Design a protein around this ligand. Structure first.
Ligand SMILES: Cc1ccc(C(=O)NO)cc1NCc1ccccc1
Ligand SMILES: [K+]
Ligand SMILES: [K+]
Ligand SMILES: [Zn+2]
Length: 401
């Protein structure tokens, strides 16, 4: 079974932010327009039996004072009057400003992604679904007591925490395909060997958030019993589908071989697309040159490990829907063994006119340092296996590269 998180109130809240607008409605309505909904099990977002239960769930990672401050920010933005000087200082102390401003539903919006991804984790734990999709989640930059990068609450960290705590041990592999380094998730599990994190991303001087690269400098990779358990691959601008695919393919396969995870969690932020306004990487959604995203998801799904697939960044809304619709169809095919035939032309539906002027499913695009990174990462995986007394065939993993 393949699940997907949605609901009427969930759709309203996911569409209530100034930054991401109606993106989630475009995504779900294109998936619906291509007749994929009957193939999928709807997973309802989690709701709680009291305010105390909600706080207990969110403060599994975030501090109570931060949660209090985020709730107060919503209240204040639901009244006409501006903040007092003391209220400005309070919000500033949690970085609730600049990139992460207040707006009238900021807390309900943020909490909704948590509700969706916690329900997705439970559906995997109870074996109701083999894979669950939540295009409303993936907010990987939020920290314990700090908003960052328009991420206010880290739904990813909370989902992973539910997975590892459900248990000769439970291990989670987190794979972050976003253009940006997944710093919040990496930091949350910096001391935990049972959650291995792996982010591929652009990094360069001054580019957000600044981490996930050399810090002569060296790569940090975890601490305490979590030493060697945070993996990173920073890539230069301009990379295309094939080179990005060859860059991460052998790493993914070797992480699966050595770690043998009980669950996989993928963040699939779409800001790597060639047509995203960042204009950094040159990936596509093409499906025969094969989309880097579809190559990676197909490989991860070939492992037959229960898998959570989340959204994230993506600032060209119709092209993000074009990508995530193909990811959704691919998941159905690999998991159910049931061919999905997607028309090359956008079907008529409520947002049809947003896909102009062409109305094609394909996005509108004309398509040595990596080897040193591979050597470094393979040594780190060996060190991780040594330290955690894991059994693995060094010859077979070396061949992968
Ligand atoms: C600052 C910033 C931080 C994080 C992200 C992001 O996608 N993180 O995954 C994205 C941005 N900015 C993207 C952007 C910039 C200008 C206009 C619209 C989007
Ligand atoms: K990433
Ligand atoms: K870790
Ligand atoms: Zn991003």
């Amino acid at each position: 079974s393949v699940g997907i998180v949605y609901g009427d109130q969930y759709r309203q809240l996911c569409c209530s932010s100034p930054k991401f607008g109606d993106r989630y409605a475009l995504v779900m309505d294109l998936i619906n327009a291509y007749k994929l909904i009957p193939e999928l099990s709807r997973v309802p977002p989690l709701q709680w039996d009291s305010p105390s239960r909600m706080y207990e769930a969110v403060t599994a990672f975030h501090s109570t004072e931060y949660v209090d401050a985020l709730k107060k920010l919503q209240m204040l933005h639901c009244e006409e009057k501006e903040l007092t000087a003391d209220d400005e200082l309070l919000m500033d102390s949690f970085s609730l400003n600049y990139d992460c401003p207040g707006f009238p539903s900021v807390f309900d919006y943020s909490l909704a992604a948590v509700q969706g991804s916690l329900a997705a984790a439970s559906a995997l734990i109870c074996r109701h679904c083999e894979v669950v999709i939540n295009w409303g989640g993936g907010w990987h930059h939020a920290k314990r007591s700090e908003a960052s990068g328009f991420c206010y609450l880290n739904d990813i960290v909370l989902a992973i925490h539910r997975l590892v705590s459900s248990t000769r041990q439970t291990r989670v592999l987190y794979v972050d395909l976003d253009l940006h380094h997944g710093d919040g998730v990496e930091e949350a599990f910096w001391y935990s060997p049972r959650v291995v994190t792996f982010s591929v991303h652009h990094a360069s001087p001054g580019f957000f958030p600044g981490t996930g690269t050399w810090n002569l400098p060296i790569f940090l990779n975890g601490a305490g019993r979590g030493r060697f358990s945070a993996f990173n691959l920073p890539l230069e601008e301009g990379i295309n589908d094939l080179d990005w695919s060859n860059a991460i393919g052998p790493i993914l396969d070797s992480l699966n071989i050595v770690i043998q995870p009980s669950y996989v969690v993928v963040q699939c932020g779409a800001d790597c697309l060639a047509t995203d306004p960042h204009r950094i990487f040159r990936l596509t959604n093409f499906y025969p040159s094969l989309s880097g995203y579809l190559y990676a998801i197909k490989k991860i799904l070939s492992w037959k490990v229960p898998t959570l697939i989340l959204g994230g960044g993506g600032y060209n809304f119709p092209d993000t829907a074009r990508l995530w619709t193909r990811v959704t169809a691919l998941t159905i095919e690999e998991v159910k063994g049931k061919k999905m035939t997607i028309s090359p032309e956008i079907p008529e539906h409520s947002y049809f006119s947003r896909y102009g002027p062409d109305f094609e499913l394909d996005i509108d695009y004309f398509p040595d340092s990596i080897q040193k990174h591979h050597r470094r990462i393979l040594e780190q995986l060996r060190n991780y296996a040594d330290l955690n007394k894991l059994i693995y065939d060094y010859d077979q993993v070396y061949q992968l590269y």
